[PDB]
């Protein structure tokens, strides 16, 4: 046995292209549309719950994932690759930061660690790149609210707002017209729902849409009282009912 | 054990005793404490018998490999440093060695290096090593000069071992003499202390304390 | 390095004209406590060898499994496993002797003294000793522990040298062994009355005797012994 | 604490003749104050006209002899059935012994045979591999009793010629195989009288150009 | 680990990876070595395609391995650093254990041995570098000049060149260099080295580097003006 | 077995070139142009972000200019993810040198170390090389202000003024024309921006499409200050030089 | 064709070509003959020379006092395998005080060669071996092929033109098996068997190589003027 | 591509066969064994006149009683020589004696096939190992990269090998003297060499029981060349 693939499976072609990264990006293009919008007092991330079967319980599959109490993530592309990335991202937030500094990492540095993992899959022996693009929304004390995109190459860019996947080209154009630097969180959620409706074919409701926010601290979601400095997670996943309420005022 | 080696006009004199002991028990009186590394290098042994033989025998293999690779005989400095670096790897493990690496080369001339199982490596003109070293030093220091004849230098070395063989309980048996020159070492025989003592006493007029 | 916990005492043995006898009591001691009263310390290997083991019982059980496994392994791809290529006492011993010395050399010994008794293919008697240190020796009589001090003297009165072996019958040899076992019961504080005895004869094969007892003991004279010197009543 | 060493007693003796060599050893094997065996062979024929004995801790002794016998076998395989000379065997044994420098074979080794000129040869070893060719060597428990007798009766030490009074030494005349065996037997009888670990039997191996011959003699069994 | 056999034999008995490593040397800038009676000179080409360079800090072509030995090269620049570093370490290691600086032959033998090792080790390609190693042995006034190449073979040279258009400058040296009477002085040796480079170099401005090594650890690199004086004198004599 | 699928990243062409190095350089030739200009009283680093968007958060973004220590900085050209791996290694290397010798690492030593790492990927391991070219701008008390560049081959060279990435041929010609040795930082700032403005593939050069930095002795007395320019500061210098 | 690049690849008909190519190396090798009776076992080998100045390549190797083999094919592979046997014979002696059974020695060689045919990177052994020995169940003769197949036989031959000697033994089966307590007559039958595989060249003094093992006969090799008796 | 340890359909290792082709391109080396000693001679073949020919070391000492000549990719031989020297010295350390020439050769040949995917390819060099021991006397061995070694009375390897071997076929007899063998090597070298044979482009050596292994001086060889010319012109 032994992993005898100790050589790179991603290499430069004569034209200077890294084929496997380009192909990974093509796999992301086929993936379901997901987006992110940054407001003044929060960030919103959203995507369509493309159910593979009506017998399947789409609540059990979580496209939007908590990484830290103040950082969340969503994707477009291959779901299984995303799932393992979330597992590694959650763990690296502890091992490379929280167990050292006694606090959760700021968004940009966690993103940097995720990016590193994805870069290594692009250069290390016997592996293909990850077939996903991530949108990581988060908050920290010194940088405030932020939104980052992470590609199969490991490259990451900060966005005011963006979209990835199926109808990203049209969605990004839609966001450019609507976005401004004075948006409140509720306004961003409203724009997120409008933008996402364009890329969705079938049913459009709280059960077919997954949406989470990075906003105010939620002391009700903390689980304990008695420590003033611990005020609760800024990440919150919106319920099926909470989405439908905003779809009536749409 | 008593071993000595000193530089002089006619090269180097090397002299050693022959006794080996296990506690108060005399294990051997015929031990070869000079090791012929090559036609120009000598090694004296003192302390642990096996440690000294094995590693000095081994040293000769390393010196041979040097001159095969470099098409040139090994220097006394390099030969001594191979041994000292080796024992230094084993420092703390309990090796017991006190040695002189004696030789002649064109670039160095006659050279003596004291090498030790503690890792000590010293260049010098005179050295005495072993349990009976202090007795040898007494005779050697009072009679040493640079301008000694090969004949007189040999006797001094022989006499210095005899002095120690007499007093030191763990030294004795017989005296092995070597003379190292520009053209290599020369063996000058095994001299039994049982016969050498009475010979020296009578001719030299020394040891008036003892009755004979 | 360990210390023995549950222990077995003397194993005694001797050669006779047509084979070998070996015996060992059925006790597993726990220090001064005579804890286990049904321990078999003679372990037959095939129909031509018996391994008698003293010392640590947990290590004895390990050795027991090694021998059991040795028989299995010998049978593999061996059409003559029950004939020409069957396990010999000399093979079984040398294997143990290798293991014992290897384990002592790793400073983690099997805390035992072992006597391998048997009969070879050519009818020759086999009797050899090995212990935790890997020390091996053979003799017309062999014994471990207290047996070495008390059994051997008695057994050597029967077979004092090699030339006495053909002169010693199985009845005389067995009688000497059974007597030695009684003596050990009188004088070894970590022995029991119950014991096992094995005879490996070149003609009648392996005879394994269980549930033997020390009998014909002399105790009556105890009634006359009073006090420790001056006392009369 | 586990003590990996033991003392199996016994005593061995090698003597080098002019065209022969002998290696003798008692056959008693012991622990503390008990006899294990009255006849446990201690001197072995290792092939190539070499005899060997590793006296002291028997388990290490047997291990060493076993490994040397193995070394002779592989010397034949690797070097076209060449005969292992006694001097080469001695150097090989040094490396076996010194190989376990920091966990030694607790034995006093002696080998005997013939050198490449056909003369008798005895080599003696300490536990950690220091060796030396000798005309005469006793080893083991009663070595302290026997060696002085051999210095006197083999090398004629402290012996002078009558009439001269200390001036002329006794000449070092060679000893025949019959003369050597007498000295061996008296050495062991004397050792048996004053050493409790020596007795039962004496086994002598004699090496000549014709091969390896054995001789056995009874010793006191007390 | 990556264990792939990259350097292997072909049906015609050639190791192409070693031969292609020589082609990389052929591409590299020209280097020349000339030994006089009491000196050795190492000439090196600097291609003038690269201007706006900072000549203070740019890695020099001639590298000191010890105070008495120097190494120049032709071929891949990045590869040469690995050989130089290893050589420099071995030079100090030799002084530490032998208590004597390396001979020029020994240092060459080591560098050549490293190059060879890379021609039959798994997962590695050969060095695309040929070196000229020059200097003076300790307490010795005899000049030394050695060459190595990717295959691992090495040999001593009265004079030698490597790199691009080395065929031309070797042609020049073969007719101009006399063994019975080599360049007696430093001037004569440097002059012959500059002359040989002028057959190939193009312009004699900043395209020629010269380094003179003399006995007893006496190494010095000539400046632009000093070299320019040689270039001037050569061409003025040529106009006749 | 696995041999079938091995690209063999570390081999020579018949011509004596390293395939993967050459192709990595082709990759870098499409990357945003980065320029370094060294002056007597400081160094300039200018670099063009690649086809940005209006929705890109510029003030928190960093794709071109990175800080290695207080004295040394780099401009990147190629894969950003690859560059960050090397940057973190270089940052550690500088700290190791500081811990060992209690002195800031000399620029060339740091540059050599990174260049040796890149070299390793071209000679052994069977992995693809890093598709990155650096411009190192730094200072130390030995050589003063220094500009270096390194590429995927692991070869590095020193420069007075240099460009990497796209349109380096056109960029180097313009720098070679207008550069002089007695030049100053303020003049070098202008040259850098003017060069990018002409070589850019974009319609017009604006503040949001640029990253800019200077290493000045322009700090209170004998010491060196690194200045990574903010979006508003890049906008001001573009107006000052008369480009917008 | 497309399925002979390495040992890890079955062909569409279920063949292992690298093993078959290794088998081919044996056929190119010089002829050697093996045969036994109830008391003795004999190896007879035709040694091959490079030219008239060269020596004749040795074909027989000793493994123990009671066992040895002859080789045909790559000699270095025979050295590796014979070295392995020497160790296994030796392990049996040191640990179990037991001479290794010839049948079991064949099983060990089979399993060693097999591992090389199923793993990637390695290669099959390029040599065939004829093992003879005398153990507790009498005289034995084995034929080893580098596919892994080991076979116990009364007599056999391997190498170039080995079919001639093999047919001869197949006819003589009833005669040579009965040659008990007579080593010279058993060798004669072996020398007469190998003669059937000769063309052009004949058996000379430095050409022929013979070995024998038996009841009271250690494994001994005969070369040079020692085999002139049998020419 | 294909495995390094692959067999051809004919039953040969591709890489071993290809290394043999590299050896054919190498410079000629000739060895001749006699009862008075073994002679080794080589073609130096300098690529240019500026190359100092005395630095070409294609004849090498392994021990005092064993010499060695090479042909092919001579850089590959260095690790083989180092192993040989170590084996020779190590055996002397373990057994207090000289090592047999065959045993030394066998130790070298054990390296040969230690290649796979250990080193990445076979050696591209053939060796003529000449020496003397007490058991088998004066010996000459040819060690290939296949792991095989043949003993020879005389042997030529390198570019002019088959032509030289045919010449050695006729010329060699069991009663050759050392002086006759020396001239014979020089005669055959001169025949197969491209350039004209002299003391600078050709080297001699021998191994005798008394003096051991000796490389010949250029002054000593020059006399033997002059002695050769006269004896050929004599008839
Ligand atoms: B000498 O006294 O140092 C001597 C030299 C040695 C080469 C024989 N050493 C010994 O005699 C030692 C004991 C000793 C005594 C005094 C100081 C240091 C050491 N004896 C042994 O090494 C030894 C070896 N084999 C058997 C008995 N003794
Ligand atoms: Mg007694």
The set of residues, in sequence order, having a beta carbon less than 8 Å from that of C207 and lying 6+ positions away, is: C198, C199, C200, C201
Is B136 annotated to bind a ligand? Reply is: no
Does the domain made of F1-244 have the CATH classification 3.60.20.10?
yes
> What are the boundaries of each domain within chain F?
1-244
Count of domains for chain D = 1
Which of C2, C136, C138 minimises the CB distance to D62? C136
b/e per residue, C44-73, with b = 16+ CB within 10 A? bbbebbbbbbbbbbebbeebbeebeebeee
Ligand 2 centre distance from Cα of residue H201 (Å): 79
On chain G, the residues whose CB falls within 8 A of the CB of C80 are 136-137
Please indicate whether, in this complex, the C-beta atoms of E4 and A125 are within 8 angstroms of each other. no
Tell me how far CA of residue E221 lies from CA of E42, E52, E134, E208, in angstroms. Answer: 10, 22, 14, 12
Strands E143-148 and D201-208: unpaired
Tell me how far CA of residue G122 lies from CA of F124, G118, G119, H114, H192, in angstroms. Answer: 23, 9, 6, 11, 40
Strands H154-157 and H149-151: unpaired
Radius of gyration of chain F from its Cα atoms, rounded to whole angstroms: 18
Please indicate whether, in this complex, the C-beta atoms of H117 and E11 are within 8 angstroms of each other. no
Domain with residue A25: its CATH number is 3.60.20.10
- Distance, in Å, from the CA atom of F33 to the CA atom of F77, rounded to the nearest integer, reads 7
D107 inside 8 A of chain C by CB: no
What is the number of the ligand closest to the CA of B22? 1
Structure tokens at D197: 């670990």
Query: Which of D61, D70, D55, G97 lies closest to C134, judged by CA?
Result: D61
Verify whether ligand 1 is closer than 6 Å to residue B173 (CB atom): no
Count of Cβ atoms closer than 10 Å to residue G75 Cβ: 21
Query: Which of F164, F146, F219 lies closest to F47, judged by CA?
Result: F164
- Ligand 1 atom with minimal separation from the B47 CA: 3
Structure tokens at D33: 């104050």
What is the CATH code of the structural domain delimited by G1-231?
3.60.20.10
The set of residues, in sequence order, having a beta carbon less than 8 Å from that of B168 and lying 6+ positions away, is: B2, B130, B131, B132, B135
Residues 169-228 of F with CB under 8 A from A: none
Q: Spell out which chain E residues touch chain F, with contact meaning CB-CB distance below 8 angstroms.
A: 2, 4, 6, 16-17, 20-27, 50-59, 76-79, 81-82, 123-125, 127-128
CA atoms within 13 A on the CB side of B23: 2
Backbone angles phi, psi at D201, to 5 degrees: -155, 155
Contact C89, C44 (CB under 8 A): no
On chain E, the residues whose CB falls within 8 A of the CB of B77 are 98-100
Domains defined along chain E, listed by start: 1-240 (3.60.20.10)
- Angle between helix axes A168-178 and A185-199 (nearest 10 degrees) is 150
Tell me how far CA of residue G4 lies from CA of E123, G9, G18, H9, in angstroms. Answer: 24, 7, 6, 8
Which of B57, B58, B65 minimises the CB distance to H86? B65
B15-B45-B190-D161 Cα dihedral, nearest 10 degrees: 120
- Distance, in Å, from the CA atom of A153 to the CA atom of A19, rounded to the nearest integer, reads 11
- Distance, in Å, from the CA atom of C8 to the CA atom of C11, rounded to the nearest integer, reads 9
Catalytic residue, chosen from B1, B44, B99, B111, is B1
Query: Which of A136, A113, A161 lies closest to F81, judged by CA?
Result: A113
- Distance, in Å, from the CA atom of A167 to the CA atom of A174, rounded to the nearest integer, reads 11
- Angle between helix axes F185-199 and F168-178 (nearest 10 degrees) is 140
Question: H30 - beta bridge partners?
Answer: H41, H156
H110 inside 8 A of chain D by CB: no
Please indicate whether, in this complex, the C-beta atoms of D66 and G94 are within 8 angstroms of each other. yes
Q: What DSSP assignment string belongs to E24-73?
A: HHHHSPPEEEEE-SS-EEEEEE--TT--SB-TTTSPPSSEESSSSEEEEE
Please indicate whether, in this complex, the C-beta atoms of H97 and D80 are within 8 angstroms of each other. no
Sign of the C-alpha dihedral, residues G16, G20, G21, G23? positive
Nearest C-alpha of chain G: how many angstroms from C89? 10
Verify whether ligand 1 is closer than 6 Å to residue B191 (CB atom): no
What is the number of the ligand closest to the CA of D109? 1
Query: Which of D16, D64, D12, D10 lies closest to D207, judged by CA?
Result: D16
On chain B, the residues whose CB falls within 8 A of the CB of E98 are 75, 77-78, 81
Nearest C-alpha of chain B: how many angstroms from E144? 16
- Distance, in Å, from the CA atom of H16 to the CA atom of E52, rounded to the nearest integer, reads 52
- Distance, in Å, from the CA atom of A39 to the CA atom of G93, rounded to the nearest integer, reads 84
Structure tokens at G76: 């270095």
Radius of gyration of chain E from its Cα atoms, rounded to whole angstroms: 18
Structure tokens at F123: 């000679």
Domain with residue D58: its CATH number is 3.60.20.10
Declared resolution, Å: 2.9
* Residue F63 DSSP class: S
Domain with residue C35: its CATH number is 3.60.20.10
B75 inside 8 A of chain E by CB: yes
Query: Which of C194, C198, C174, C185 lies closest to C147, judged by CA?
Result: C185
B86 inside 8 A of chain E by CB: no
Please indicate whether, in this complex, the C-beta atoms of B77 and E100 are within 8 angstroms of each other. yes
| CA C184 to centroid of chain Cα atoms | 13
> What are the boundaries of each domain within chain G?
1-231
Query: Which of B177, B185, B194, B179 lies closest to B16, judged by CA?
Result: B177
Q: Which chains touch F (3 or more CB pairs under 8 A)?
A: A, E, G, H
Contact H153, H128 (CB under 8 A): no
Verify whether ligand 1 is closer than 6 Å to residue B13 (CB atom): no
b/e per residue, F219-243, with b = 16+ CB within 10 A? eeeeebebbebeeeebbebbeebeb
Please indicate whether, in this complex, the C-beta atoms of H100 and D95 are within 8 angstroms of each other. no
Print the SS3 string covering C197-222. EEEEECCCEEEEEEEEECCCCCCHHH
User: Which mutation among B33, B47, B132 tests ligand 1's pocket best, with the greatest number of atoms within 8 A of CB?
Assistant: B47
Residue from C137, C138, C141 to probe the interface with D (highest D Cβ count within 10 Å): C137
Q: Which chains touch B (3 or more CB pairs under 8 A)?
A: D, E, H
For residue D35, give its domain range. Answer: 1-222
E236, containing H or E segment: helix E224-238
Count of Cβ atoms closer than 10 Å to residue F95 Cβ: 12
What was the experiment behind these coordinates? X-ray
Radius of gyration of chain H from its Cα atoms, rounded to whole angstroms: 18
- Distance, in Å, from the CA atom of E21 to the CA atom of E18, rounded to the nearest integer, reads 5
User: Which mutation among B48, B94, B99, B133 tests ligand 1's pocket best, with the greatest number of atoms within 8 A of CB?
Assistant: B48
Contact C126, C15 (CB under 8 A): no
A117, containing H or E segment: helix A107-123
Verify whether ligand 1 is closer than 6 Å to residue B27 (CB atom): yes
Backbone angles phi, psi at B206, to 5 degrees: -90, 180
Contact A119, A156 (CB under 8 A): no
CA angle H189, H192, H195 (to 5 degrees): 85
Which of H4, H19, H75 minimises the CB distance to E152? H75
Contact F81, A119 (CB under 8 A): yes
Contact G87, G59 (CB under 8 A): no
Backbone angles phi, psi at F102, to 5 degrees: 55, 35
Tell me how far CA of residue G126 lies from CA of A78, D209, G113, H157, in angstroms. Answer: 50, 45, 10, 26
- Ligand 1 atom with minimal separation from the B25 CA: 27
Ligand 2 centre distance from Cα of residue C22 (Å): 29
Q: Which chains touch C (3 or more CB pairs under 8 A)?
A: D, G
The residue behind tokens 């693939």 is: A5
Domains defined along chain B, listed by start: 1-212 (3.60.20.10)
Tell me how far CA of residue A36 lies from CA of A115, A152, A167, in angstroms. Answer: 18, 18, 14
Query: Which of C104, C42, C39, C47 lies closest to C71, judged by CA?
Result: C47
Nearest C-alpha of chain F: how many angstroms from A54? 37
Count of domains for chain H = 1
For residue H93, give its domain range. Answer: 1-235
């Amino acid at each position: 046995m032994t992993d005898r693939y100790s050589f790179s499976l991603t290499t430069f072609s004569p034209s200077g292209k890294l084929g496997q990264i380009d192909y990974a990006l093509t796999a992301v293009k086929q993936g379901v549309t997901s987006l992110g919008i940054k407001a003044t007092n929060g960030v919103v991330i959203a995507t369509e719950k493309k159910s593979s079967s009506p017998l399947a319980m789409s609540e059990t599959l979580s496209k939007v994932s908590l990484l830290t109490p103040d950082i969340g993530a969503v994707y477009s592309g291959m779901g299984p690759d995303y799932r393992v990335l979330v597992d590694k991202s959650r763990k690296v937030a502890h091992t490379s930061y929280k167990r050292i500094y006694g606090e959760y990492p700021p968004t940009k540095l966690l993103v940097s660690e995720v990016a590193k993992i994805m870069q290594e899959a692009t250069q290390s022996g016997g592996v293909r790149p990850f077939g996903v693009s991530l949108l990581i929304a988060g908050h920290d004390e010194f940088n405030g609210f932020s939104l980052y995109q992470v590609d199969p190459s490991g490259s990451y860019f900060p966005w005011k707002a963006t979209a990835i996947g199926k109808g990203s080209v049209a969605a990004k154009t839609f966001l450019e017209k609507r976005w401004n630097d004075e948006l409140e969180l509720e306004d961003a959620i409203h724009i997120a729902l409008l933008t996402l409706k364009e890329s969705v074919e079938g049913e459009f409701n709280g059960d077919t849409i997954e949406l989470a926010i990075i906003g105010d601290e939620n002391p009700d979601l903390l689980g304990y009282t008695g420590i003033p400095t611990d005020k609760g997670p800024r990440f919150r996943k919106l319920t099926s009912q909470e989405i439908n309420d905003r779809l009536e005022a749409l | 054990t008593t071993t000595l080696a000193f530089r002089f006009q006619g090269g180097i004199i090397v002299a050693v005793d022959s006794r080996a002991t296990a506690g108060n028990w005399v294990a051997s009186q015929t031990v070869k404490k000079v090791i012929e590394i090559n036609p120009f290098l000598l090694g004296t042994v003192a302390g642990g018998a096996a440690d000294c033989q094995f590693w000095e025998t081994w040293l000769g293999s390393q010196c041979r490999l040097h001159e095969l690779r470099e098409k040139e005989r090994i220097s006394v400095a390099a030969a001594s440093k191979i041994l000292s670096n080796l024992v230094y790897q084993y420092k703390g493990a309990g090796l017991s060695m006190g040695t002189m690496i004696c030789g002649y080369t064109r670039k160095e001339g006659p050279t003596i290096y004291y090498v030790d199982s503690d890792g000590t490596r010293l260049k010098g003109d005179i050295f005495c090593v072993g349990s009976g070293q202090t007795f040898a030093y007494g005779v050697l220091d009072s009679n040493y000069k640079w301008d000694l004849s090969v004949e007189d230098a040999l006797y001094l070395g022989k006499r210095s071992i005899l002095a120690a063989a007499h007093r030191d309980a763990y030294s004795g048996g017989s005296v092995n003499l070597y003379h190292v020159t520009e053209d290599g070492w020369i063996y000058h025989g095994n001299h039994d202390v049982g016969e050498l003592f009475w010979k020296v006493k009578e001719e030299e007029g020394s040891f008036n304390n003892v009755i004979g | 390095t360990q210390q023995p916990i549950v222990t077995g005492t003397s194993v005694i043995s001797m050669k006779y004209d047509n084979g070998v006898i070996i015996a060992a009591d059925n006790l597993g001691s726990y220090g001064s406590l005579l804890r286990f009263n049904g321990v078999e310390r003679l372990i037959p290997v095939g129909d031509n060898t018996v391994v008698g083991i003293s010392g640590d019982i947990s290590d004895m059980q390990h050795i027991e499994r090694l021998l059991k496994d040795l028989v299995t392994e010998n049978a593999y791809d061996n059409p003559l496993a029950d004939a020409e290529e069957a396990l010999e006492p000399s093979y079984i011993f040398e294997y143990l002797a290798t293991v014992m010395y290897q384990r002592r050399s790793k400073m983690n010994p099997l805390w035992n003294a072992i006597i391998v008794a048997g009969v070879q293919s050519n009818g020759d008697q086999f009797l050899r000793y090995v212990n935790l240190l890997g020390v091996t020796y053979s003799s017309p009589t062999l014994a471990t522990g207290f047996g070495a001090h008390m059994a051997n003297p008695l057994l050597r009165k029967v077979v004092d040298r090699e030339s006495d072996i053909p002169k010693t019958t199985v009845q005389v040899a067995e009688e000497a062994i059974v007597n030695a076992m009684r003596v050990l019961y009188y004088r070894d504080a970590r022995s029991s009355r119950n014991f096992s005895l094995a005879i490996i004869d070149k003609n009648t094969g392996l005879t394994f005797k269980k549930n033997l007892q020390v009998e014909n003991m002399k105790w009556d004279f105890a009634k006359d012994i009073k006090g420790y010197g001056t006392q009369k009543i | 604490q586990f003590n990996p060493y033991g003392d199996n007693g016994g005593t061995i003796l090698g003597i080098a003749g002019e065209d022969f060599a002998v290696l003798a050893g008692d056959t008693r094997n012991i622990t503390d104050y008990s006899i294990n065996s009255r006849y446990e062979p201690k001197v072995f024929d290792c092939g190539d006209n070499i005899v060997m004995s590793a006296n002291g801790f028997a388990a290490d002794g047997d291990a060493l002899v076993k490994r040397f016998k193995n070394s002779v076998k592989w010397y034949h395989f690797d070097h076209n059935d060449k005969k292992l000379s006694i001097n080469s065997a001695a150097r090989n044994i040094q490396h076996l012994l010194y190989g376990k420098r920091f966990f030694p074979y607790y034995v006093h080794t002696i080998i005997a045979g013939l050198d490449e000129d056909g003369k008798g040869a005895v080599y003696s070893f300490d536990p950690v591999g220091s060796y030396e060719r000798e005309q005469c060597r006793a080893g083991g428990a009663a070595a302290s009793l026997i060696m002085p007798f051999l210095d006197n009766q083999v090398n004629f030490k402290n012996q002078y010629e009558p009439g001269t009074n200390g001036k002329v030494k006794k000449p070092l005349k060679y000893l025949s195989v019959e003369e050597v065996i007498k000295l061996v037997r008296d050495s062991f009888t004397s050792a048996t009288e004053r050493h409790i670990q020596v007795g039962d039997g004496l086994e002598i191996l004699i090496v000549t150009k014709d091969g390896v011959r054995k001789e056995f003699y009874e010793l006191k069994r007390d | 680990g990556y264990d792939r056999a990259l350097s292997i034999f072909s049906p015609d008995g050639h190791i192409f990876q070693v031969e292609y490593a020589l082609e990389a040397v052929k591409r590299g800038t020209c280097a020349v070595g000339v030994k006089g009676k009491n000196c050795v000179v190492l000439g090196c080409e600097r291609r003038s395609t690269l201007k706006l360079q900072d000549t203070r800090i740019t890695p020099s072509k001639v590298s000191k391995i010890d105070s008495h030995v120097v190494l120049s090269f032709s071929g891949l620049n990045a590869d040469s650093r690995i050989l130089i570093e290893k050589a420099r370490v071995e030079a100090q290691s030799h002084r530490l254990t032998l208590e004597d600086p390396v001979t020029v032959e020994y240092l060459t033998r080591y560098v050549a041995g490293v190059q060879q090792r890379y021609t039959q080790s798994g997962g590695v390609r050969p060095f695309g570098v040929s070196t000229l190693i020059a200097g003076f042995d300790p307490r010795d006034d005899e000049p030394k000049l050695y060459q190595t190449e990717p295959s691992g073979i090495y040999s001593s040279w009265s004079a030698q060149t490597i790199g691009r258009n080395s065929k031309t400058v070797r042609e020049f040296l073969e007719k101009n260099y006399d063994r019975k009477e080599p360049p007696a002085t430093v001037e004569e040796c440097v002059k012959l080295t500059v002359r040989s480079l002028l057959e190939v170099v193009q312009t004699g401005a900043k395209n020629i580097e010269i380094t003179v090594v003399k006995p007893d650890s006496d190494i010095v690199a000539l400046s632009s003006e000093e070299i320019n004086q040689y270039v001037t004198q050569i061409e003025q004599e040529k106009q006749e | 077995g696995s041999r079938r699928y091995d690209s063999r990243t570390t081999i020579f062409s018949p011509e004596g070139r390293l395939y993967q190095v050459e192709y990595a350089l082709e990759s870098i030739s499409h990357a945003g142009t980065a320029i370094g200009i060294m002056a007597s009283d400081g160094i300039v680093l200018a670099a063009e972000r690649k086809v940005t968007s209006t929705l890109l958060e510029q003030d928190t973004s960093t794709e071109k200019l990175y800080k290695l220590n207080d004295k040394i900085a780099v401009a990147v050209a190629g894969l950003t993810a690859d560059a960050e791996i090397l940057i973190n290694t270089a940052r550690i290397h500088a700290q190791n040198y500081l811990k060992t010798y209690n002195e800031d690492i000399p620029v060339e030593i740091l540059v050599r170390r990174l260049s040796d790492i890149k070299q390793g990927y071209t000679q052994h391991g069977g992995l693809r090389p890093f598709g990155v070219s650096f411009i190192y701008a730094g200072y130390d008390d030995r050589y003063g202000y220094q500009l270096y560049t390194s590429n995927p081959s692991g070869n590095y060279t020193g420069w007075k003024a240099i460009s990497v990435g796209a349109n380096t041929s056109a960029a180097q010609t313009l720098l070679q024309m207008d550069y002089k040795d007695d030049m100053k930082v303020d003049d070098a700032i202008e040259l850098a921006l003017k060069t990018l403005s002409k070589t850019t593939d974009s319609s017009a050069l604006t503040y949001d499409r640029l990253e800019f930095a200077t290493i000045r002795k322009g700090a209170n007395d004998g010491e060196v200050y690194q200045k990574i320019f903010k979006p508003q500061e890049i906008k001001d210098i573009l107006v000052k030089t008369g480009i917008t | 064709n497309n399925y002979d690049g390495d040992t890890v690849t079955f062909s569409p008909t279920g063949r292992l070509f690298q093993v078959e190519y290794a088998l081919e190396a044996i056929k190119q090798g010089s002829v050697t003959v093996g045969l036994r009776s109830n008391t003795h076992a004999v190896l007879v080998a035709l040694k091959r020379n490079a030219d008239e100045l060269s020596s004749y390549q040795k074909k027989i190797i000793k493994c123990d006092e009671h066992m040895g083999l002859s080789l045909a094919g790559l000699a270095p592979d025979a050295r590796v395998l014979s070295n392995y046997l020497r160790q296994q014979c030796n392990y049996s002696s040191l640990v179990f005080n037991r001479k290794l059974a010839v049948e079991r020695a064949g099983h060990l060689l089979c399993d060693k060669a097999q591992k090389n045919t199923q793993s990637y990177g390695g290669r099959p052994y390029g040599v065939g071996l004829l093992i003879i020995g005398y153990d507790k169940s009498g005289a034995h003769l084995l034929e080893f092929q580098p596919s892994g197949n080991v076979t116990e036989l009364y007599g056999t031959a391997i190498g170039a033109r080995s079919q001639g000697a093999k047919t001869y033994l197949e006819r003589t089966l009833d005669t040579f098996i009965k040659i008990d307590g007579n080593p010279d007559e058993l060798i004669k039958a072996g020398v007469e068997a190998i003669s059937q595989s000769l063309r052009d060249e004949s058996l000379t003094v430095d050409n022929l190589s013979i070995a024998i093992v038996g009841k009271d006969t250690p494994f001994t090799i005969y070369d040079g003027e020692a085999v002139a008796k049998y020419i | 591509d294909r495995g390094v340890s692959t067999f051809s359909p004919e039953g040969r290792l591709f890489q071993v066969e290809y290394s043999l082709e590299a050896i054919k391109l190498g410079s000629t080396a000739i060895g001749i064994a006699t009862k008075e000693g073994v002679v080794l001679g080589v073609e130096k073949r300098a690529t240019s006149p500026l190359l100092e020919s005395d630095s070409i070391e294609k004849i090498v000492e392994i021990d005092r009683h064993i010499g060695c000549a090479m042909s092919g990719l001579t850089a590959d031989a260095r690790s083989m020589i180092e192993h040989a020297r170590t084996a020779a010295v190590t055996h002397n350390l373990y057994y207090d004696e000289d090592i047999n020439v065959e045993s030394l050769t066998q130790s070298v040949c054990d390296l040969a096939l230690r290649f796979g995917e250990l080193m990445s390819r076979p050696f591209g060099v053939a060796l003529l190992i000449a020496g003397h021991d007490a058991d088998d006397g004066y010996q000459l061995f040819h060690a290939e990269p296949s792991g095989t070694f043949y003993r020879y009375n005389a042997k030529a390897i390198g570019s002019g090998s088959e032509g030289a071997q045919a010449e050695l076929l006729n010329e060699w007899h069991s009663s050759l003297t050392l002086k006759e063998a020396e001239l014979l090597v020089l005669k055959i070298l001169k025949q197969v060499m491209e350039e004209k044979l002299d003391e600078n482009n050709a080297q001699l050596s021998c191994i005798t029981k008394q003096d051991g292994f000796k490389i010949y001086d250029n002054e000593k060889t020059a006399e033997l060349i002059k002695e050769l010319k006269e004896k050929e012109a004599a008839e």
